[PDB]
Amino acid sequence: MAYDYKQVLRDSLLFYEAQRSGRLPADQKVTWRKDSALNDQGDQGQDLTGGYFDAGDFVKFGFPMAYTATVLAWGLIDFEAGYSSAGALDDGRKAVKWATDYFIKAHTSQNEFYGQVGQGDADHAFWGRPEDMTMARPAYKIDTSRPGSDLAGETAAALAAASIVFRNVDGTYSNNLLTHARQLFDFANNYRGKYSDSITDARNFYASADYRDELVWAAAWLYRATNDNTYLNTAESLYDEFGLQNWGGGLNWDSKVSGVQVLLAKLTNKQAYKDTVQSYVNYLINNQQKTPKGLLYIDMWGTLRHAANAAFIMLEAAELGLSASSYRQFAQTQIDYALGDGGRSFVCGFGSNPPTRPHHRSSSCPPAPATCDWNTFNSPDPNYHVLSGALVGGPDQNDNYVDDRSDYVHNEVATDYNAGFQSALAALVALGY
Ligand SMILES: [Ca+2]
């Protein structure tokens, strides 16, 4: 009852601090985390340190990491007031920059981009503190011979969105972000292909369903960041060519459909895009399967992540003047469910009876020199460190849930899980809720 969205927003930022890879800053707030993955590098030894660990593991999966950055930047642009009111503007910007500083390093050549550091199996076979890793961490890339329109496109979108975020605060960085964004889009558009067909290790973790939506997504963001009509023309041309108006709605690391539509609706003010957004939202509120307690049930994987993403699309739709009151209200019910209106909180470190055993390695570990290994994973006790701000997978279609570390469905946590969620919190704060 009566949730402090400002504090939840601050908590979400703490989750991102807990996901930081590389050398941590002197002002780090989640201090149980230590410098790690300091040897991450490319084929020629290029520095690839930094970025975010994806979930409860230590692999740096570029596709969802870029998506996370784009959505976080998006919320900072449209609902900056929310961050400011929560006294978290600086931290919000730092969260975006932690990702973009890494994308810049990963962009080793104009048409070359590293999309992963660490191998799924080698990484997942280990359970412990990231600073204790001793296994090889291979880096995989996409290039003109092994394209990745989806990966390069999303990264371009994130860089372009970030360039807007930093336009005034750091003009030099903003310009740099944009240069990289422009080059990555050209690479993505001129060399068509799914990144997971090149970086095959990712096909079993973050396989891309289609790269066409990312191309439109990227062009749209570049137009917003440059005001260069060429990008708008390309965005709309591809939107029509690919027939996105007929694609299944939704917004998540894999599909940008609803994001593209609500974004283009804002940039062009065209009714057609607004119609598509309305039909999608009305469908969710009135028809999409929901749990008995009101939670949108879009899929078993990252259930809350899907509901929060939907909530964010609704908040963006409200900004277009589409049923603002009802759309904002429904979005709030989804966020409020995650915060505890379903009976318990599903945000670690927050509210009533929150999850205490997230499927997360670093938070499960006691401090050094005590050993952290699979026996720690096997502990009946709650994770040693509270993972403040992490949104877990959530309850089942019947609002049932059991806090279980081995349950990588209900207790999974990930950077993409908190993206739409965090931006939605920023919006609620901005709206004065
Ligand atoms: Ca896609």
Which of these, 199, 270, 188, lies nearest to 232 by C-alpha position?
270
Q: Cα–Cα distance between 180 and 187 in angstroms, integer?
A: 11
Helix (H, G, I), strand (E, B) or coil at 184: helix
User: Which residues are bridge partners to 296 per DSSP?
Assistant: 290
Using an 8 Å Cβ cutoff, are 226 and 248 in contact?
no
- Centre of ligand 1 to C-alpha 339, Å, is 29
Residue entry with tokens 């470190």:
349
- Cα(245)–Cα(321) distance, rounded to whole angstroms? 20
Helix (H, G, I), strand (E, B) or coil at 142: strand
How far is Cα of residue 45 from the mean position of the Cα atoms in its chain?
Answer: 28
Sign of CA dihedral 207, 209, 210, 213: negative
CA of 63 to the centre of ligand 1 (A): 10
> Of the candidates 161, 216, 220, 419, which has an alpha carbon nearest to the alpha carbon of residue 312?
419
Residue 159 to residues 8, 163, 227, Cα–Cα distance (Å): 26, 6, 15
| 80 annotated to a ligand binding site | no
Contact 42, 122 (CB under 8 A): no
**What is d(CA 410, CA 16) in angstroms, rounded to the nearest whole number?**
19
Map residue 140 onto helix, strand or coil.
strand
Q: Which residues fall within 8 angstroms of residue 363, CB to CB, at 6 or more apart?
A: 18, 32, 383, 384, 385, 386, 387
Determination technique for this PDB entry?
Answer: X-ray
Distance in angstroms (rounded) separating the CA atoms of residues 57 and 341: 30
CA-wise closest residue to 32 among 390, 418, 386, 417:
386
User: How many other CB atoms are there within 10 angstroms of residue 90's CB atom?
Assistant: 12
CA pair distance 400, 346, nearest whole angstrom: 12
How far, in whole angstroms, is CA 422 from its chain's centroid?
9
Spatial distance between the Cα atoms of 220 and 236, rounded to a whole number of angstroms: 8
Report residue 181 as tokens: 């964004």
- Can you point out the beta strands (E) in 129-171? 139-142
Strand partners, 259: none
Q: Got the DSSP string for 396-415?
A: -TTS-----TT-TTTS---H
Distance CA 138, CA 178 (A): 28
The sheet with strand 60-61 has its strands ordered as 60-61, 113-117, 139-142
Whether the Cβ atoms of residue 205 and residue 217 lie closer than 8 Å to each other: no
Burial class (CB in 10 A: 0-12, 13-18, 19+), 45: exposed
171-190 helix and 212-226 helix, angle to the nearest 10 degrees: 150
Q: CA-CA distance, 61 to 59, in Å (whole number)?
A: 6
Domains annotated on the chain, with CATH:
1-433 (1.50.10.10)
**Of residues 80, 134, 175, the one with CA closest to residue 429:** 80
Q: Is 213 annotated as a binding residue?
A: yes
> Is the CA virtual torsion 249, 253, 256, 259 positive or negative?
positive
Question: What distance lies between CA 249 and its chain's CA centroid?
Answer: 18
How far is Cα 216 from Cα 248, in angstroms, rounded to an integer?
15
C-beta separation of 342 from 3 below 8 A: no
Closest CA to 89 of 75, 105, 101: 75
3-state SS string over 50-113?
CCECCCCCCCEEHHHHHHHHHHHHHHHHHCHHHHHHCCCHHHHHHHHHHHHHHHHHHCCECCEE
CB-side neighbour CA atoms (13 Å) of 24: 20
Looking at the annotation, which residues are catalytic? 403, 412
Token duo for residue 169: 């605060």
Task: Provide Rg for the chain, Cα atoms.
Answer: 20
The b/e string for 172-190 (b: 16+ C-beta within 10 A; e otherwise) is ebbebbbebbbbbbebbbe
Please, which residues have CB less than 5 A from ligand 1, an ion? 210, 213
Q: Would the CA dihedral through 368, 369, 372, 378 be positive or negative?
A: negative
- Residue 9, exposed/middle/buried by CB under 10 A (0-12, 13-18, 19+)? buried
Virtual CA dihedral for 117, 118, 124, 129, nearest 10 degrees? Answer: -90
Q: What is the 3-state secondary structure (H, E, C) of 190-233?
A: HCCCCHHHCCHHHHHCCCCCCCHHHHHHHHHHHHHHHCCHHHHH
Residue 152 CA to ligand 1 center (angstroms) comes to 11
Task: Determine the distance separating the centroid of ligand 1 and the alpha carbon of 212, expressed in angstroms.
Answer: 6
In the 3-class helix/strand/coil scheme, how is 271-290 assigned residue by residue? HHHHHHHHHHHHHHHHCCCE
Map tokens 């694609």 to a residue: 247
For the record, the structure tokens of 171 come out as 């003009």
Resolution in Å equals 1.5
Cα 381 to ligand 1 centre (Å): 39
For residue 157, report the distance from its CA to the centre of ligand 1, in Å: 13
Q: Is 214 annotated in some ligand binding site?
A: yes
On whether the CB atoms of residues 248 and 209 are closer than 8 A, the answer is: no
